[PDB]
Amino acid sequence: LDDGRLTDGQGRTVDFRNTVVIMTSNLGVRETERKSIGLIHQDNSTDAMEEIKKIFRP
Amino acid sequence: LKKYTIDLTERAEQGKLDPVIGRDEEIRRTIQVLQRRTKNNPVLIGEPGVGKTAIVEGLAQRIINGEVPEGLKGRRVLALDMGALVAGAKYRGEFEERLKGVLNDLAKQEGNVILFIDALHTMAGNMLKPALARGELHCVGATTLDEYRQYIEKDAALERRFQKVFVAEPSVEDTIAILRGLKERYELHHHVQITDPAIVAAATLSHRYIADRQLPDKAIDLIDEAASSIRMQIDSKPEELDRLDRRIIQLKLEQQALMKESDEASKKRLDMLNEELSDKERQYSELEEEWKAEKASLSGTQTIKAELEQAKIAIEQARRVGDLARMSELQYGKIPELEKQLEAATQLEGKTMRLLRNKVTDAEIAEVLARWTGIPVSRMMESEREKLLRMEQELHHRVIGQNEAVDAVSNAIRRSRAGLADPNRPIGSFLFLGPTGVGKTELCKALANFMFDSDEAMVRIDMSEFMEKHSVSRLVGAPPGYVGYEEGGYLTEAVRRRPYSVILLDAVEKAHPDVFNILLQVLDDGRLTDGQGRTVDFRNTVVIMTSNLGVRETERKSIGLIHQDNSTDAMEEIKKIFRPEFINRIDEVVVFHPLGEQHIASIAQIQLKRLYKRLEERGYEIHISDEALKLLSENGYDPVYGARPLKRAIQQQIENPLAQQILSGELVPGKVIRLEVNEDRIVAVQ
Amino acid sequence: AEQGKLDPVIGRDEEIRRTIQVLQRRTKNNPVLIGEPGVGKTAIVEGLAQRIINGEVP
Amino acid sequence: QIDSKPEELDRLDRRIIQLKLEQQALMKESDEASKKRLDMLNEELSDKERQYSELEEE
Ligand SMILES: Nc1ncnc2c1ncn2[C@@H]1O[C@H](COP(=O)(O)OP(=O)(O)OP(O)(O)=S)[C@@H](O)[C@H]1O
């Protein structure tokens, strides 16, 4: 995510400079079911960002 | 004895030895070990390049200069030659025929012969044991540290016999003394001269920088390679000579182009070409005549070099064998005459040698070394104090902004490199507050590129990175003796390219107080006992520690207001959350701020400089207005992250529509773009 | 190289003078060209040999 | 230490060998009149030969 490279086993890198890493996430489902509609979007950015802060890095 | 063994009486007597310099401790230890009644097979712990074979050459200068004690005199010491023992073996098994014949005659010799095994670690293994164990011979050895550690300790009678002696690589002034003792063979073998600061700077800087190679080995690479460079380029013809040689060969070929004519009155113009040919031939003849004049000085000094080395070998052999009239004959007589007209020969090269340079100085060492390494020579021409006082200028070449950071951090680096902190500290004891993406990695690249000379030099640590207690075992990899000798440590990789590091220790306050104590051991003592327990010198490591406490008020207090206000009321928060010991550790408190209005315009236009060059290759030139980039700015200025959705709103707001407008056919290349001012969504117009 | 069946070594003079300075050394005399291949190691040897046969060699 | 010779006979032996190697150089003299000075070196040299005889007898 910083480089588009991956320092693999022998000491080389892996060429990721022109491809895309993709990740479907199973966390913010019911939070999105709570924000829509009638609840503010940045509130779900807030507390969904909070459980991300329990489980991810920013 | 004879055909496959050689007496060192006649090898040290013949003098196949390079001169040695003051090798006292190891040779006297060799004497007292060789006077033990058993385990008198001393093994020298070291590698060649400290000159272990040369230490044996000097013990042979103490046999042949008579400087050995009463114990080791009278002994008739014959050396084995396995390279002679391979001779006469055709059918399979005659080398060990002649080898056990060596066991026959050195068996009957019964103690008369001390053995020296050149390259002991040639000496198999089950058959070297019974002759020594019965006592049939007497030898001396030498091998590598690691080879020795895998050599003695296991076997019973092998650690009974083979013996430890501390022999090491010297300090500065002793390697200086070795190069002084060897400039006899250097100068009088390599057609060169050597002065004292070349030896002092060679042994000193070679001692300091390269902790890899050996002393005086790498200085032997310098004097050997560079001295032959001086001899070789002295053999070459000078520069004005071959400038004029190219000009006369072009003028002769053009004269041949002028002689073959069809129209006479147009092609008989070559008279001025002929007189210019005569003048340039005269000048080239005079300059090559000067080259032969310097070769005449080198002719006389060449034959007096030959008779000179014959003269000092004559006075030393006169010291050795002892003819009476020949000693005083040479002493008052032949050799001081060659000393006086040797001085007249040094004045002969001191007045004849104009083009070719016989004397070797540090500049040719900077030639051979400047084409060895490849690091810029101006970085050695730089001093520390000058690149401390002129740091703001080159920091204002690349990086724009951060005035109190460059000035006050420059005060911390002038204090730190000046020594105005505790010298038991790392280099930069910092504390940085502010958001991410304002140039911290860019500051590591800029300082790394200036004083560390790299666009590749930064590793960064946020506290959520932390590869764990097991990870120090991961960079030592497997313990030694397991699988993984193919890689081992990737310590060898990330520390292959960068021995130093500039580290961006993010969010120091959000870490545990155990990281206030581990990082207190970082800021104190200039070294950290890590999770494994060993410690590595942080005194060659700037400990840059960054943080993200007060984001919003720092994003406000940037334009117009003084920044010492933000630093001091930041320290009103720092005093509460830290101990006063941490405030004692760091020198000053610097807080990074997001830049001002015209400098935010500098940030957006620098992020669009990629678009200027990516597009100026393809044939598009934007002249973006301040108002279209301003709609990029205020449509980018989200107070959440700072300038981090500013790139998202530049590339997403214009450039994805600008990729649709350029890549659709609306923007024709070869024409100057001005990003105009419509409604708030921005549309490029040709 | 005397029949002319080969190709010239053009430019890159720090490398050719580098190997020649390695050659002229007495102790540690012989060279090794070392790199990840495809930089012209035998072709740098051809830089030496073409410099020798051209007569412009020091 | 039992098998060798002590220190003061080494010091006196080196200074006597040095002065008699100076004597071999000073017998073949260039100017016999201006070089009369070595008479004290001859008398003190004979004194060192007497002391050398005593110490070597010991
Ligand atoms: N700098 C260069 N100069 C000339 N040719 C080069 C260069 N770099 C790569 N090449 C090409 O790459 C090849 C590799 O160079 P070589 O002359 O074969 O040196 P090499 O690495 O010793 O290869 P060998 O002989 O198989 S070990 C050359 O034959 C050229 O086709």
Swiss-Prot record, chain B:
Binding positions for ATP 2 per the UniProt entry: 434-441
Signal peptide: none
Highest taxon of source: Bacteria
Region of interest called NBD2, as start-end residue ranges on this chain: 384-594
A biological process term (GO) from this entry: cellular response to heat
Stretches for region Linker: 170-374
Record keywords: Acetylation, ATP-binding, Chaperone, Coiled coil, Cytoplasm, Nucleotide-binding, Repeat, Stress response
Annotated segments matching region C-terminal: 595-686
Modification sites for N6-acetyllysine: 16, 469
Induction / repression: By heat shock and other environmental stresses.
Effect caused by changing residue 372 to F: No effect on chaperone activity or ability to form oligomers
Binding positions for ATP 1 per the UniProt entry: 46-53
GO cellular component assignments: cytoplasm; cytosol; membrane
Compartment(s) where it occurs, according to its Swiss-Prot or TrEMBL record: Cytoplasm
Subunit structure comment from the entry: Homohexamer. The oligomerization is ATP-dependent.
Protein's recorded name: Chaperone protein ClpB
Protein's organism: Escherichia coli (strain K12)
Phylogenetic lineage: Bacteria, Pseudomonadati, Pseudomonadota, Gammaproteobacteria, Enterobacterales
Gene that specifies this protein: clpB
